[PDB]
Structure formats: C-alpha cells, structure tokens
C-alpha cells in the first residue's frame, strides 16, 4: 500500500545496508522513479543476462552458433551446477548453456560461456563497446558471490544496468531474433519465484534474472507489464546488511506489490 519510493526507503530502513532501485519506461527510455541510481552494487548472477547478450552478439556477427555443442568434464564443474552436472556425457549446446545460465543460474554454464569469448575482461569490453562504461565483470564463478565490500569489481549501478538492459532488449544492437531469444530465456526463469513473481497479478508478462550473494546481497532485473507485453524495466539491488535470505526476499516482493498497485 505505500507508494513505491516510500516502500524502497522503508526496506533500507528495515534491512540496513543500501537498496538501489530504478524504473524505466521501455519504449521511451525515460526514468520514471529512482533511488541511489548512480551508486554501485554487486551484480551477482544478474550478469548472466549480459553474458548471453554478448553470445548472441557473436551469433548475429557470424562468429558463433547457438547449436554448437560443447563437451566438458567433471573437472570443469563448480559449485551450483544443477543442469550442467547432468550432461557430462552429452554436453550442451551454446543455446542450452544460455538457457541454464539464465533460467537456473547455473554457474558452470556461465563459466563455459565466458570461455567462449575469452573471459570476464572480454565481457567488460563488450559492455564498453555498447556505451556502458560503468558495469564491470572481473571474476569467474563461483567467486562473484563471496565477501563483497567492495571493491568496484563485479559491480554495476542501477541506471547503468537498466539502460544496458533496455539497449539489449529493444535497441538495434541485436537482431530481432536475438533480442527475442534473450527475452524468452528471461521469461522462462525458474529460480526467482519469491521475488517480483510473487506479487504479479494474473496475465502480466515478466522476464527476469535474480542474484544473491554474501553480505546481505540480493537483486533482480526485470522487464514486465500488463496484458502479455513488457512495458517497464525494473532494477532492484541490495547489499551491505546482515539480513537473512527470507528477509531480503520479502522486501523485494513488497517493493513489487507497491509497484503493481501504483502502476
Ligand atoms: Ca537511508
């Protein structure tokens, strides 16, 4: 029931740490509402979307194919690889790898895709090449997750992430088929149910990616809107508190209810 900015500031009051929030109009790119928009937060697994953006960029350029099959071994597996650990004999295609990285937050799938483009510093270069000189990836999985403060490593700001997400989803940086593929993976997200999804009314569209980390970190990037079609981008990050997972999740779901009731 409180207005969205009030609820965001309330969430920070209750949790400690910092909460960062932006709501952007997808068609116009106008900032509709913000809180700590230019401050840095850890990205956590929300970078997996930007990673698959870079893959699809290579596909549109003729340097990659989504059906290319990648084989790997048990020695490649890292913590939290629920899809990739099931495909040791058959491997996965590049397209399956993006689906696993986005929809299940598979860490081996992300690492494998980062190998295809030459590592974290190459993802950062792709972002620079599209006009985002703020967001940076420095680490491989699973060692994003870990003790965060700060540095600037593996961080973005709400306005940078949102702007960069809008460029990927609606710009002419990717072909129409690649833009639709990226949004299809986000729509099929399986691991974000307690977050914005828990507040969404019947018949709304949502395409999202969540993140979680140490030092009270949690976040979500999402494109959503009524009647089957996305119309706004919403970015929420939090970090720096001693809050439990259940506490973090609840605050994001309450921010979500506010945003919906005041649409
Ligand atoms: Ca405050």
Automatic annotation (TrEMBL):
Claim: Calcium is one of the keywords in the record: yes
Domain Beta-lactamase class A catalytic per the UniProt entry, residue ranges: 25-238
Disulfide bond annotation, renumbered to this chain: 52-98
Keyword Transmembrane belongs to the record: no
Enzyme class, UniProt record, top EC level: hydrolase
Keywords assigned by UniProt, alphabetized: Antibiotic resistance, Calcium, Hydrolase, Metal-binding, Signal
Binding site residues for Ca(2+): 12
Enzyme Commission (EC) number: 3.5.2.6
MF GO annotations: beta-lactamase activity; metal ion binding
Catalytic activity: a beta-lactam + H2O = a substituted beta-amino acid
Family from the record: Belongs to the class-A beta-lactamase family.
PANTHER family attached to this UniProt entry: BETA-LACTAMASE (PTHR35333), BETA-LACTAMASE-TYPE TRANSPEPTIDASE FOLD CONTAINING PROTEIN (PTHR35333:SF3)
NCBIfam families: bla_class_A, blaTEM
Protein name, entry field: Beta-lactamase
Protein source organism: Escherichia coli
Gene expressing this chain: blaTEM-63
